[PDB]
């Protein structure tokens, strides 16, 4: 084994797995990591990109390394929870709200 002479040329295996859809999970798309729902998109890519971006410079679309189908990345449902109460001096029933 000889190092400190050239960049990376030969590496080892990667142990790829299957694909899931319609769920927000963490992914490793050739170095890109993030959480988002894997959904089929409508746009078309030229045959030399790997992933796309937006005005926020974040991950919104990616090309799978196994096939030629374009994917879309969107985060799932999240937000700050809100509460509605009449006060402890009047009643005890509460109405929880998702914003």
């Amino acid at each position: 084994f000889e190092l400190l002479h050239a960049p990376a040329t030969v590496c080892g295996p990667k142990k790829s797995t299957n694909l899931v859809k319609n769920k927000c999970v963490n992914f490793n798309f050739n170095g890109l990591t993030g959480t988002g729902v894997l959904t089929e998109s409508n746009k078309k890519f030229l045959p030399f990109q790997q992933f796309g971006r937006d005005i926020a410079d974040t991950t919104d679309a990616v090309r799978d390394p196994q096939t030629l189908e374009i994917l879309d990345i969107t985060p799932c449902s999240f937000g700050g929870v809100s509460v509605i109460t009449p006060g402890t001096n009047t009643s005890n029933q509460v109405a929880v709200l998702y914003q």
Binding site: G79, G80, Q99
Partner: peptide, 21 residues
């Protein structure tokens, strides 16, 4: 009215946008 219609047509992560009340 057509005035507000024309006015509405004239004018155009981890982040949440609260809708107006």
């Amino acid at each position: 009215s057509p005035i507000e219609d024309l006015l509405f047509n004239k004018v155009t992560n981890g982040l949440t946008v609260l809708p107006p009340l």
